[PDB]
């Protein structure tokens, strides 16, 4: 319960919409993508402008309210909603300005990937981001951001040229390579630790149609397929991206009925470049095993972005355990296949991703993002509907991770689950974590922004 | 040259960006999708809120500035930019609020379709809109709006429940079936004639993955493909949509190279419903000729929306002639094939669309959209790059229209070209036009909003 004068100053300054626990849309406004997170904020402030975010940060600081910031609400740790605090909700700040001649996009901090991609593709332009359209740009970029265009053009942060950011003191700063470069280093991988980003500026690239393929392999052939994949990606051109999703086969017409619901490897691949070269490149990796349900298409980049994932179903409840690998040993390969064979929910995926390429050619210390030199990512992404089955699916992800943990290092902060606060130092490493703390001490000394993979100051 | 106190009142009330002819970004900001339209506004006002729009509409009325209103900039007539007037540019008002429980979306007037579909598809929901993601939602909906979901769920306006609209006098109104219903009737098909819509409210539908097919037929087999189409679509269930696009075959690896750049029928089809039924239904319509470069996929609806058109090239210069047909005779089929054989630009399409279904079940006078009872639309959509070639592409469109004029009636206001201001009466018909003139006399009696398929008051 709040100070009336502080609240009245807030209401007069704030031009967005405020949602209170008694309002009709409070229950839908406080849900985030991870539906296991059920929390009740004192206030949700739907900002519509940078002055709105200023007023909301300042109101929160003066009132002592625990601050959650929300872009697209996809935090796998549930950081975008809080008990008893204020949600600074950016979802209505979804505007993008694209300059075709300059190959530049300026995107507000609340954009969804699909809105961003629609705007840039109006000019046949693009820049790297994640693979599911309704993910928020904000959290994704601040953690690094990888997807289809990343082996060719780097992480999202490798194309970021500046931000507008509201800091804990209510100030509005620009951070770039020429202005507050210490803060600009930190926001490229350091998350929401340093303030609320209200606008991102990106360099764009011309991206025409891309040759794309998706197919399914039986777990029978898993050893030969995963070994073909890790061997080929070690020397693959930047232009090829190839990812493996172990999952239950979806009940789709392109798959034989006897495969529906059983563990398979879903392989998805694309060529960023000439589609005829892409057709030759993909044809040579599609037959590592017998391809079932093969879909080949020459897609506009916006449609590639909208494709993931097959079955198009939004799960209510999720739990993720992830790490990087420097090498994918045969022992790690067998472990991945044994646990994939035990997947229970049709929405769970054991993801095997290969980064590298342009991501790995950026010097390690040039941004806050850790583990550019590890090309493999494995993600035990459990997802289900029924809340009484939480233990089944959570246990699957935990046991898989534990059996792999010796082969893993680091961790992508954007794949951390609600119980992985203690993983922050191991994810960043000692040198980056220490540098991040010094930037935290300068820009957020009270740790007002602590609903994130948190960096304590000093 | 403007009255300096009306100017300063406006700038004080306006919290958005103003672009003047001397500013560096003026030339990029004044371009619209139809690059044959080259106009120089006195002022571009980039609105960020409904009060911004109120200030701009009032400033234009007080100053006598000619008003262009801009959503997504896709006017085939060039109406979203003006010489010497003001552009009320809505492109930054791109926010969408979605209720999963109530299956409702509220979208601002500047949204692009792809941003809208991303936000609704985050909940596996959708509502009918156009087929190209970067089209503006504003002008599309005010004209009617049809696309992949229309045979199943109707026009965009058929799912619209209310608008917030800024009228010529500067007031903000709600318009619905229970509040200002004469205005609500008129904005569902009447264009921007009655004010600036700053928010649309839509009913949503659950749309999971849809089975989709695109393929290409030789003109050799042209007559039997088009007759199969027009025969099948007369009795096809609502769940099937099947459209034909006669064009030069794009140079894509799924097509043999000997077909590249030569006239073909591009056939695109989808089933809105169970994908296994969809696979049977599409296969039953795919083989009236030999299908070259066949792509079949089970796509999330958002990826279907992002798919058009194959080759993903944005043309610089366009010219369109369109009308409705009540029937497609063999004689008209021959004319369409003859004219398609003469297509010169790789970006031109002679489109043959079939609406009907749920569109035709809405009583004719329920909205201002005309010609629900004509199921065929043909669109001679010329598009090219080289400005020295305008005459030839323009001529193709008009010669083709004139050769089909015995079969064509009415006309979609959203497909009309810059020289077609005279066609407004024929498009709506005398009775609808008369009623529209009465709503205009009430809400825009000075015809402040005249850059549209214009309806003069009285
Ligand atoms: C279905 C799905 C697919 C994904 N795919 C990918 C992928 O392909 N690649 C990838 O790299 N990641 C991917 N992710 C992970 C994604 O990067 C993270 O979940 C990210 O945190 C999501 O950001 P958000 O704004 O949507 O989330 P939120 O829950 O809104 O926010 C996440 C964190 O960022 C902070 N934050 C958000 N916006 C801002 C802002 N404007 N300013 C300051 N702080 C902010 C929040 O405080 C919180 O700490 C995926 C996640 C999901 C659920
Ligand atoms: C590539 C392409 C694909 C298309 N596909 C389809 C399709 O599948 N189906 C279909 O039905 N049509 C389609 N169209 C046509 C489309 O409906 C019209 O071009 C429409 O006018 C585009 O709206 P806009 O806001 O993008 O255009 P703009 O140029 O911004 O505006 C068009 C008109 O509407 C007015 N206007 C725009 N927004 C508002 C608003 N918020 N309030 C008041 N007036 C407003 C403008 O004053 C102008 O008169 C397509 C067009 C293109 C170029």
UniProtKB/TrEMBL annotation, chains A, B:
Superkingdom of source: Bacteria
Classification via Pfam families: BBE, FAD_binding_4
Cofactor(s) recorded in Swiss-Prot or TrEMBL: FAD
Gene name of the encoded protein: encM
Keywords, comma-separated and alphabetical: FAD, Flavoprotein, Nucleotide-binding, Oxidoreductase
Flavoprotein found in the keyword field: yes
One annotated GO molecular function: oxidoreductase activity
Protein name: Putative FAD-dependent oxygenase EncM
PANTHER family per record: BINDING OXIDOREDUCTASE, PUTATIVE (AFU_ORTHOLOGUE AFUA_1G17690)-RELATED, FAD-BINDING PCMH-TYPE DOMAIN-CONTAINING PROTEIN
Residues where FAD binds: 69, 71-75, 80, 109, 131, 136, 139-140, 146, 197, 412, 414, 451
InterPro entries: BBE (IPR012951), FAD-bd_PCMH (IPR016166), FAD-bd_PCMH-like_sf (IPR036318), FAD-bd_PCMH_sub1 (IPR016167), FAD-bd_PCMH_sub2 (IPR016169), FAD-linked_Oxidoreductase (IPR050416), Oxid_FAD_bind_N (IPR006094), Oxy_OxRdtase_FAD_BS (IPR006093)
Family statement: Belongs to the oxygen-dependent FAD-linked oxidoreductase family.
Domain FAD-binding PCMH-type: 37-207
